[PDB]
Amino acid sequence: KTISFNFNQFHQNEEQLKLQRDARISSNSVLELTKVVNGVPTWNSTGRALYAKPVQVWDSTTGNVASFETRFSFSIRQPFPRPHPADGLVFFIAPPNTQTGEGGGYFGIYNPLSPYPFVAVEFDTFRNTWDPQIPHIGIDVNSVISTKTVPFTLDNGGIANVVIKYDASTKILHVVLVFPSLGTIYTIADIVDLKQVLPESVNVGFSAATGDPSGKQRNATETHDILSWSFSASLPG
Amino acid sequence: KTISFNFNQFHQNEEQLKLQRDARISSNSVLELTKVVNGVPTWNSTGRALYAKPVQVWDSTTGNVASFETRFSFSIRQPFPRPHPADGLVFFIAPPNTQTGEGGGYFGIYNPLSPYPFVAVEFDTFRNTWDPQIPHIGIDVNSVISTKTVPFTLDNGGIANVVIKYDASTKILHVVLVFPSLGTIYTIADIVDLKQVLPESVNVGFSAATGDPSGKQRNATETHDILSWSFSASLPG
Numbered sequence: 001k002t003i004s005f006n007f008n009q010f011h012q013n014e015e016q017l018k019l020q021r022d023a024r025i026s027s028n029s030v031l032e033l034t035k036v037v038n039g040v041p042t043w044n045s046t047g048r049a050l051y052a053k054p055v056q057v058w059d060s061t062t063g064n065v066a067s068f069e070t071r072f073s074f075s076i077r078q079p080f081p082r083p084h085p086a087d088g089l090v091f092f093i094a095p096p097n098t099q100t101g102e103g104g105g106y107f108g109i110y111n112p113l114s115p116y117p118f119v120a121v122e123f124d125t126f127r128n129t130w131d132p133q134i135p136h137i138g139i140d141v142n143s144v145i146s147t148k149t150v151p152f153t154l155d156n157g158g159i160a161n162v163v164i165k166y167d168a169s170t171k172i173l174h175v176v177l178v179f180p181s182l183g184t185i186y187t188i189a190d191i192v193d194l195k196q197v198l199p200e201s202v203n204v205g206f207s208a209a210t211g212d213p214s215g216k217q218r219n220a221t222e223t224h225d226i227l228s229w230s231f232s233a234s235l236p237g
Numbered sequence: 238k239t240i241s242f243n244f245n246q247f248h249q250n251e252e253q254l255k256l257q258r259d260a261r262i263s264s265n266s267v268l269e270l271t272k273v274v275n276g277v278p279t280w281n282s283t284g285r286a287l288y289a290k291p292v293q294v295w296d297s298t299t300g301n302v303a304s305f306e307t308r309f310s311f312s313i314r315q316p317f318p319r320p321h322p323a324d325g326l327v328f329f330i331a332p333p334n335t336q337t338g339e340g341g342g343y344f345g346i347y348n349p350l351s352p353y354p355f356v357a358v359e360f361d362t363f364r365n366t367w368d369p370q371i372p373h374i375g376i377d378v379n380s381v382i383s384t385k386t387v388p389f390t391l392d393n394g395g396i397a398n399v400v401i402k403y404d405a406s407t408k409i410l411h412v413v414l415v416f417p418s419l420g421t422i423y424t425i426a427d428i429v430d431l432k433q434v435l436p437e438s439v440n441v442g443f444s445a446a447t448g449d450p451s452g453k454q455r456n457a458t459e460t461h462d463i464l465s466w467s468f469s470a471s472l473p474g
């Protein structure tokens with residue numbers, strides 16, 4: 001049972017994508033997770049993009065767990081250096097049919113009033129009380145307080161290539177971050193037992209957020225654009 | 238005791254390196270592991286390059302294991318497409334003071350008549366009976382029969398960037414392969430317990446080999462050049 005899809009670009013009204021909140025697809029085919037008006041990103045924005053169909057990461061009958069690989073390109077343009085850009089974007093897996101969570105440092109995937117489990121890879125740009133120096137790549141399991149973290153230097157407005165791979169047999173989740181214009185390579189890995197944290201069927205997608213109003217800083221913002229994306233998952237079941 | 242060295246280039250007569258067999262440093266400063274005469278690589282060649290000093294990967298007193306990161310660039314130029322280039326190059330960790338092993342598919346690190354333990358990351362270009370499709374990246378533990386394998390497409394004569402990282406706490410060895418001219422990214426990871434396979438002190442280095450005479454193919458060859466190399470290890474004990 002192999003499931004896969006590929007988007008070299010994004011078209012408006014794409015039937016295989018579920019856009020939520022501020023998420024929208026632009027004319028020039030880029031997936032803009034957070035709000036951008038007249039070429040300028042605003043604060044108080046939150047958006048998600050889910051692959052319309054659910055994917056099966058494990059089977060209770062056989063006990064088998066799926067292995068998967070996903071690649072995508074994103075771009076984060078930080079127009080206002082001071083006081084501080086916010087908040088970042090993440091790739092995530094969660095139960096099907098969830099709603100957008102809290103914005104800000106929660107990226108729109110965590111909802112304290114009705115927490116739902118999730119596994120996510122974050123590209124954190126703002127330093128919250130629970131964060132190490134930013135920007136950083138982080139592996140999140142049911143929480144925004146990463147299990148593993150690695151710092152990286154952003155290529156403002158540049159293109160970033162990401163490769164995320166999950167090995168069911170070793171339970172290793174390894175992500176690679178590359179900024180082709182700078183030739184920089186960042187790597188991070190950790191052990192995650194999907195069968196233990198998530199249900200058999202899940203949704204895969206992205207979520208991002210800009211500065212929260214409570215910070216009283218309209219400059220706390222940046223873009224969170226997804227340029228392309230492919231996914232592939234295999235269940236030996 | 239954090240140890241680390243960096244070679245942005247290679248100088249003739251490098252006090253820091255132990256060259257063995259066919260390994261040499263060229264005029265333009267590249268480390269040529271295997272023989273190349275008048276701009277053409279030959280068969281029946283084997284060479285290794287070890288960092289002169291030994292590194293401590295674990296301490297029996299505290300039981301602690303080191304974490305390390307190594308980056309290097311290499312180039313493999315395959316002049317003769319048919320019938321099949323050979324054999325590839327590896328980055329390895331072995332007990333100090335070892336001797337070059339068998340050539341060919343053994344890369345010069347395995348010696349059947351007196352086997353010594355080793356951990357190595359291979360960039361295999363020839364398909365032996367025990368191999369999957371080539372080229373492929375492979376993680377080798379005391380054997381040339383990889384524990385994990387991933388296929389990749391070579392950039393003939395192009396430059397390749399490699400990042401190898403080892404996490405003592407998770408025991409995850411993850412390697413990343415990038416061909417900047419093509420923008421391709423390959424990743425592979427596995428669990429390796431250094432403390433269980435290697436002695437407290439080891440040598441780190443490279444080894445490569447071209448076609449073995451027994452194959453009767455002089456075209457079974459390619460270059461195995463190392464352009465730069467940085468290493469860093471951190472033992473908490």
Ligand SMILES: *[C@@H]1O[C@H](CO)[C@@H](O[C@@H]2O[C@H](CO)[C@@H](O)[C@H](O)[C@H]2NC(C)=O)[C@H](O[C@@H]2O[C@@H](C)[C@@H](O)[C@@H](O)[C@@H]2O)[C@H]1NC(C)=O
Pocket residue numbers: 079080081082083219
């Ligand atoms: C939010 O971003 C604005 C645009 O970058 C900041 O204003 C810019 O500040 C520059 C100083 O670094 C100045 O040279 C630019 O002319 C100015 N750009 C414009 C058209 O506003 C702004 O900084 C605040 O406001 C400016 C006008 C000054 O009063 C600064 O002292 C302020 O810090 C940023 N706002 C905040 C709260 O940082």
Ligand SMILES: *[C@@H]1O[C@H](CO)[C@@H](O[C@@H]2O[C@H](CO)[C@@H](O)[C@H](O)[C@H]2NC(C)=O)[C@H](O[C@@H]2O[C@@H](C)[C@@H](O)[C@@H](O)[C@@H]2O)[C@H]1NC(C)=O
Pocket residue numbers: 316317318319320456
């Ligand atoms: C070993 O590599 C050689 C160079 O790549 C091969 O010879 C070249 O073969 C070309 C056609 O494949 C031909 O156009 C070239 O002129 C020739 N190069 C020269 C001038 O030597 C060689 O191929 C075999 O041997 C040559 C001499 C020819 O007889 C070919 O027809 C043979 O396939 C490669 N060896 C083998 C056996 O693959």
Ligand SMILES: *[C@@H]1O[C@H](CO)[C@@H](O)[C@H](O[C@@H]2O[C@@H](C)[C@@H](O)[C@@H](O)[C@@H]2O)[C@H]1NC(C)=O
Pocket residue numbers: 281450
């Ligand atoms: C492979 O390289 C070795 C050097 O390490 C050479 O000795 C081999 O040459 C062959 O074997 C030697 C012992 C001698 O008989 C010589 O005449 C042979 O050519 C070389 N093998 C080949 C086939 O070139």
Ligand SMILES: OC[C@H]1O[C@H](O[C@@H]2[C@H](O)[C@@H](O)[C@@H](O)O[C@@H]2CO)[C@H](O)[C@@H](O)[C@H]1O
Pocket residue numbers: 086087103104105106126128210211212213214215216217220
């Ligand atoms: O300003 C952007 C920022 O707003 C929120 O954080 C603020 C404040 O900036 C922070 O330092 C701390 O004191 O928490 C405040 C909110 O209670 C938001 O949580 C954060 O993610 C970011 O959007």
Ligand SMILES: OC[C@H]1O[C@H](O[C@@H]2[C@H](O)[C@@H](O)[C@@H](O)O[C@@H]2CO)[C@H](O)[C@@H](O)[C@H]1O
Pocket residue numbers: 323324341342343363365447448449450451452453454457
């Ligand atoms: O020709 C290069 C090749 O030689 C050796 O392999 C030969 C033969 O080419 C191969 O197909 C198989 O039959 O094994 C033979 C040796 O027993 C060598 O092992 C291989 O690594 C490469 O050098």
Ligand SMILES: *[C@@H]1O[C@H](CO)[C@@H](O)[C@H](O)[C@H]1NC(C)=O
Pocket residue numbers: 044213
């Ligand atoms: C933030 O956005 C929400 C809806 O997205 C809106 O109700 C709220 O008033 C906004 N707050 C500010 C400060 O604009």
Ligand SMILES: [Ca+2]
Pocket residue numbers: 087105124125126127128131
């Ligand atoms: Ca944060």
Ligand SMILES: [Ca+2]
Pocket residue numbers: 324342361362363364365368
């Ligand atoms: Ca081989």
Ligand SMILES: [Mn+2]
Pocket residue numbers: 122124131132136138144146
């Ligand atoms: Mn974080």
Ligand SMILES: [Mn+2]
Pocket residue numbers: 359361368369375381383
């Ligand atoms: Mn192999």
